[PDB]
Amino acid sequence: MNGIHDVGGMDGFGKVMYVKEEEDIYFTHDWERLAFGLVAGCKAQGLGMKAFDEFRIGIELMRPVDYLTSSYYGHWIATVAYNLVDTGVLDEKELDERTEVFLKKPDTKIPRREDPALVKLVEKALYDGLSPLREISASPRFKVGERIKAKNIHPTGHTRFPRYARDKYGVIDEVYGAHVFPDDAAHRKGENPQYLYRVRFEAEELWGYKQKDSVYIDLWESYMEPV
Amino acid sequence: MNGIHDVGGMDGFGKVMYVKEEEDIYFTHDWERLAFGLVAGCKAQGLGMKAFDEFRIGIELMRPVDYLTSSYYGHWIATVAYNLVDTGVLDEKELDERTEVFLKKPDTKIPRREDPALVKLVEKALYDGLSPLREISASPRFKVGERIKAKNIHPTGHTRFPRYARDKYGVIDEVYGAHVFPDDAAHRKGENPQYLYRVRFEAEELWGYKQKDSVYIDLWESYMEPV
Amino acid sequence: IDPRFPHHHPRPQSFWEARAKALESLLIEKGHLSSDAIERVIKHYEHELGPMNGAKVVAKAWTDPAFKQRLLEDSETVLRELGYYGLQGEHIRVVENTDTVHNVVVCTLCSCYPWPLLGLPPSWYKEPAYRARVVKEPRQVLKEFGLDLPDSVEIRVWDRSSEIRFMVLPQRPEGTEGMTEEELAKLVTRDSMIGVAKIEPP
Amino acid sequence: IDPRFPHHHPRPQSFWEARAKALESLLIEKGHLSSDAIERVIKHYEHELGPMNGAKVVAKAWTDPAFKQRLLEDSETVLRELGYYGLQGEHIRVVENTDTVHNVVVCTLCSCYPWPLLGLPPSWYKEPAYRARVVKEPRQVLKEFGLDLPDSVEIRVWDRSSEIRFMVLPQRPEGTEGMTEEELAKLVTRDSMIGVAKIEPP
Ligand SMILES: [Cl-]
Ligand SMILES: [Cl-]
Ligand SMILES: [Co+3]
Ligand SMILES: [Co+3]
Known about the structure:
Largest interface: A-D, 105 and 87 residues
CATH topology of the domain at 133-226 in chain A: SH3 type barrels
Number of helices of chain C: 9
Shape of chain A: globular
CATH class of the largest domain in chain C: Alpha Beta
Bound molecules: chloride ion, cobalt (III) ion
Structural class of chain A: alpha+beta
Protein name (chains C, D): nitrile hydratase
Oligomer: heterotetramer
Organism (chains C, D): Bacillus sp. RAPc8
Helix content of chain A: 25-40%
Number of helices of chain A: 8
Strand content of chain A: 15-25%
Strand order of the largest sheet of chain C: 1-4
GO molecular function, one term (chains C, D): nitrile hydratase activity
Distance between the termini of chain A: 25 Å
EC number (chains C, D): 4.2.1.84
CATH architecture of the domain at 133-226 in chain A: Roll
Order of helices and strands of chain C: HHHHHEEHHHEEH
Order of helices and strands of chain A: HHHHHHEEEHEHEE
Largest sheet of chain C: 2 strands, parallel
Enzyme class (chains C, D): lyase
Shape of chain C: globular
Radius of gyration of chain A: 21 Å
CATH superfamily of the largest domain in chain C: Nitrile hydratase alpha /Thiocyanate hydrolase gamma
CATH topology of the largest domain in chain C: Nitrile Hydratase, Chain A
Helix content of chain C: 40-55%
Distance between the termini of chain C: 57 Å
CATH architecture of the largest domain in chain C: Alpha-Beta Complex
């Protein structure tokens, strides 16, 4: 989707807010910590999302005005809500009512429950991770060193193909192997893995600029075609 | 500039808010009326802006979060402020202080002044308009029917070349004549007029889509090259 | 406001209001503007202009074949002769809807609209949804206006990237036999002159 | 709220807070989450992980040529052997800064960052300014961090569009003769492993 999230190459967002590492506080509000717990806790159990693909599309679907103002963990809250409702884990009406309760009475008590089995399960997920690497029977269409065409495609659903790289020539830098295909997986349409490549693009090609800059982007096979 | 204003081809902005014409109120707040008066009144006298080019870049430069939330006449206020300060008509510190006065005391009295000569001058501007059409000594580079290349250019200043049309093939539909060149004029760098063309682009070329849709865009000569 | 995240925090609309008043006050104090100059503009755009002008041009085109021919051959000369000319209406073109061609006008980059002929643009015309979507999925956008064109009808979207303006000339509907030019003009909607609606039979 | 313009009005951050609590409450009531599962996650990301892990890898590379060679030849095997593996760190690559090549890592589409090796990303890394700009004007972005590279130095920006993660291996600075591996590790900054800074002489 050609959304507000896809910012690469945009002008006008201003200076980067530099801060020294030691002063770069992770969390300033408890709800931000909670957002992390919600995301990892749900994902570890496959609730609403099993990999990050579905997670990302829920963020991408935010109203632009929300995306730009919610703050970062606001994205995480938005996508957990989106995905839990979308998959039928939570009912939208119930979620909205409960939201209203905490809006009007922020000090409403949170129910307590200990589940050490669930802790172990979550811990296992944090340490084991979840690799999207798969094997497929096909061979790679492209080879290291090949000049390829990064296609002009405009999926309305999820994609990992940034707009700034579309309709451009690039050079294959590496064949990673086959990875779960985001444009399908984010919409629960199957892993349908495809070869993933790293592709180098020159500044002259991306922007028409004259400096010694390049961008290395990872692109799925179906994003590209031979020249 | 590849800014938040350049929305053509973006996904996620949602449904169009249909409203019946008779119910589609022009203004709901007096400051919105005032914004119109400020823009036209200043422009009529060449204060901050002489044509719409400088006007547009001031809007394009807004913080994205402001652009999306200010409401439409908020853009107009932002660009009048920007341009009057940029050209030295108003001092930023004085403007900020006076803003603060009206923030804390909204009912602060507005000074009254009648200037019938100025009224006539403004009226003349509203009726006479201001055509950007010029004559130049050069001939057009392109001809009706010619298949051209809409270049992949990425000016960081003002342009009228929407990103969705860049790096595409199109067909010349009309040679309008030479018009004041926005990419220069918006930055007070001279009219430097160039031939303006209307160019037809097919849906297949813009989006890879299969319906009988096309877009007719007006492009300055320097945005394009022969094939 | 965490100084890492000033960009999360929009100006409230009270800011723009205050800013407007501050500009107004300073410019009048400095002799750059006057109360009556500001009011003159507001009167013009809120009251003097409107879509009725375009409606008259459409009705005339429907009732006078020679006029319609001249309009389509050289709209800028014809419209200027009628007095529909001014700021943001210096160069106005007219495109005819036909049975297999449907025209839609947009300013993707902002809001460009022919004020002297049509008055101020619709609320939605200036907003991102219409602007973003109409160049890419015009059929979907049109359906939200109640216009569901067949696949076989070609759509031409006219993105106003220059100061050239376009008005859509919509087709005269059924059921209008014997109507006067003035009566037909009352049928012509603002939306029909942008391309987001056909005109209904009376 | 004028129903023409709901998109002008962001959710306040109090909404997200309330929403978070509502989700937490409902999920615990339904048996999907527990208090201790949520706390376990918070402990891991706020306290257990951090850039010190990457720092140790850098210092080892500087002090042990054979290790640096293995790391650059097959980083994923080597990093997994060290235990720097987990969620968002399943496939970690390492790119070496050299005198004429400077590496910078970004996730233009979101925030992708190798948590198991580097901990949580910088505030600015996740925000639009860095994300938008670093792929197009990296020299300008780097200058805002105090890194002013000569034109002759090539910049390679690594946009993390897949789950493959990258760490930058920065060069050992002058003035470090005789330092132990542990002492060198204390020199390695988070920013240097993203590519937005070189390491200063002690
Ligand atoms: Cl029609
Ligand atoms: Cl370095
Ligand atoms: Co416009
Ligand atoms: Co990311």
